[PDB]
Amino acid sequence: ALEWCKNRLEITGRSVFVDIMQQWVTGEEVPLYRHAIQQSIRLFLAGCAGILKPVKCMEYPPFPRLVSHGTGSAVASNLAFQHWLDLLLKDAVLDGDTIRQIDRIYLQSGIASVKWETIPEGARQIITQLMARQYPDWFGVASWSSHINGADCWTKLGVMQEHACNCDMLMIIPTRLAIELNGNSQLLTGVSTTHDLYSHLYGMAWPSGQNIIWQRDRINSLRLDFDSPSYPPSAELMGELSAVFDCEIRHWYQEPVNGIRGYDCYDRGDHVDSGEYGAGPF
Secondary structure (H helix, E strand, O other): OOOEEEEEEEEEOOHHHHHHHHHHHHOOOOOHHHHHHHHHHHHHHHHHHOOOOOOOOOOOOOOHHHHOOOOOOOOHHHHHHHHHHHHHHOOOEOOOOOOHHHHHHHHOOOHHHOOOOOOOOOHHHHHHHHHHHOHHHHOOOOOOOOOOOHHHHHHHOOOOOOOOOOOOHHHOOOOEHHHHHHOOOOOOOOOOOHHHHHHHHHOOOOOOOEEEEEEEEEOOEEEEEEEEEOOOOOHHHHHHHHHHOOOEEEEEEEEOOOOEEEEEEEEOOEEEEEEOOOOOOO
């Protein structure tokens, strides 16, 4: 049976920072990065339809179907698509900047204002097929569906989600564009999968936690417990947590079956010490 790791956190200081972090823990904040990737899917779909084309002549080697309809008058819609192609080609993080630049370019592309059947026949053939085929990665579902409704799917992808899951870590070390679009598939040849990036960035392939329980302990003070798959989040990530939230994070972790236990302290981005797991007391 897959064994889960118990993490316990004790955090401090400073009232206003432990408030924004509590929001992180509760998923109150909006995950702007999800806006970037849902916009990138629509851009990617549009480009495959040919209802957005490059203006420079250029390749996209991982998926030449993205640019198979040629060029490309010099209008705003297709000028924004080039800038998007640039980001995609560099597999852009995902910070930023590169979020607020993915909806600037999304703003005229002008594809927010499709629209699903003013689109040719034609384009609908192609978009639906890609969505069907990439459905479990783009739509957070286990399995392909025997039927999909193009209009609904194309709609779903236009509606930005407004709350993030609890302890969403993609808020903390950013993910990257081409991979997100590849999800766990082999759509994009040569491009890595989301499973592999997460492993590398966060030290676990699922960058969140479950069985989240917490306590505003004192106004200077937050206690967080949560379960992670197999392993605790990386030092790298935990380090970043405490920089992002300008806090001191005391981290106790334990998975009995593989004998991983430990203690690490992180302070304002710095790994201030580690040790043996004591315990440190609920």
